[PDB]
């Protein structure tokens, strides 16, 4: 059973701007997704400080980066707090309507696209490099769900029958044909060192056969 939803007009506009604006510094998508993972990990850590059972779904707090050249996917996995179905529908747990308004007001006052994360909508920078994004998520208070969008104004949500995750979020980037540099180990390492060198959780870059 698949449910199809329309993005709010402002979010559709944000996505079309990210997809259609000429902007060469696309590598920031990875910084933004790693930052979102760090924020999700901080949230489950904080909840566990007063309720240790919150980590019964998994004690390890980490971020994995998994390139797959056969599938042309880069996957960012974290064991953070995850998202409920309601969170997914509500713009992946963001205040994206007001964040988009603040971002676009900053742009017309001289900011650039790389500042997107300051407005709480950094997730959508995935569309700098991905033609389709799949988000698999499990929150302690809900079942495992898959969100997906190829932009174009709509997204889908379905219960996920795939591999159980325990707790956290997996962002699967189905990369555009001309963005395969982001599957190369040396390129990913360079971006992580440039922008994420201080993230307070272990980041493991998986290698391929």
Ligand X SMILES: Nc1cccc(Oc2ccccn2)c1
78 is in an annotated binding site: yes
Name the E strands within the chain.
Answer: 2-6, 63-68, 73-78, 130-138, 145-149, 154-159, 168-175, 203-205
* Binding track, positions 152-171, relative to ligand X; x by CB under 6 A: --------------------
Select from 89-97, 111-119, 131-139, 197-205 the region that touches ligand X (CB under 6 A).
197-205
CA 112, CA 149: separation in Å to the nearest integer?
24
**Would strands 63-68 and 203-205 be described as parallel, antiparallel, or unpaired?**
parallel
When the beta carbons of 137 and 196 are compared against ligand X, the nearer one is 196
The residue number whose beta carbon is nearest to ligand X equals: 198
For the segment 116-145, give every residue that binds ligand X (CB under 6 A). Answer: none
| C-beta closer to ligand X: residue 110 or 200 | 200
Out of 8, 12, 16, 35, the only residue in the binding site for ligand X (CB under 6 A) is: 35
97 belongs to an annotated ligand binding site: yes
Find the helix or strand (DSSP H, E) in which 56 lies: none
Indicate the residue among 78 and 87 with the shorter CB distance to ligand X: 78
Stretch that binds ligand X, among 30-38, 75-83, 136-144, 175-183 (CB under 6 A): 30-38
Residue 90 annotated as binding?
no
Which residue in the set 20, 50, 70, 197 belongs to the binding site for ligand X (CB under 6 A)?
197
Distance CA 94, CA 35 (A): 14
Looking at the chain, how many residues does it have? 209
Binding ligand X (rule: CB under 6 A), the pick from 38, 100, 137, 169 is 38
Nearest 10 degrees: CA dihedral of 98, 99, 103, 105?
A: 20
- Check if the beta carbon of residue 162 is closer than 8 Å to that of residue 39: no
Contact between 198 and ligand X (CB under 6 A)? yes
| DSSP string for residues in 85-134 | HHHHHTTTTS-HHHHHHHHHHHHHTT--GGGGGGGT-GGGGGGGTEEEEE
**Residues in binding contact with ligand X, number by CB under 6 A:** 8
Q: List binding-site positions for ATP.
A: 36, 78, 97, 123
Q: List binding-site positions.
A: 36, 78, 97, 123
Interface residues with ligand X (CB under 6 A) are 34-35, 38, 196-200
């Amino acid at each position: 059973e698949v449910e199809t939803f329309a993005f709010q007009a402002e979010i559709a506009q944000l996505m079309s701007l990210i997809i259609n604006t000429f902007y060469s510094n696309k590598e920031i998508f990875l910084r933004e997704l790693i930052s979102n993972s760090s924020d999700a990990l901080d949230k489950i850590r904080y909840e566990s400080l007063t309720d240790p059972s919150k980590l019964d779904s998994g004690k390890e707090l980490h971020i994995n980066l998994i390139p797959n050249k056969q599938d042309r996917t880069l996957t960012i996995v974290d064991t953070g707090i995850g998202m409920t179905k309601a969170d997914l529908i509500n713009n992946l747990g963001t205040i994206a309507k007001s964040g988009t308004k603040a971002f676009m007001e900053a742009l017309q006052a001289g900011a650039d696209i790389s500042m997107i994360g300051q407005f709480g909508v950094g997730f959508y920078s995935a569309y700098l490099v991905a033609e389709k994004v799949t988000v698999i998520t499990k929150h302690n208070d809900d079942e495992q769900y898959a969100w997906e969008s190829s932009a174009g104004g709509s997204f889908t949500v379905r219960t996920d029958t795939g591999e159980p995750m325990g707790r956290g979020t997996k962002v699967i980037l189905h990369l555009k044909e001309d963005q395969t540099e982001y599957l190369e180990e040396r390129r990913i390492k360079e971006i992580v060192k440039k922008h994420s060198q201080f993230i307070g959780y272990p980041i493991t870059l998986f290698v391929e056969k």
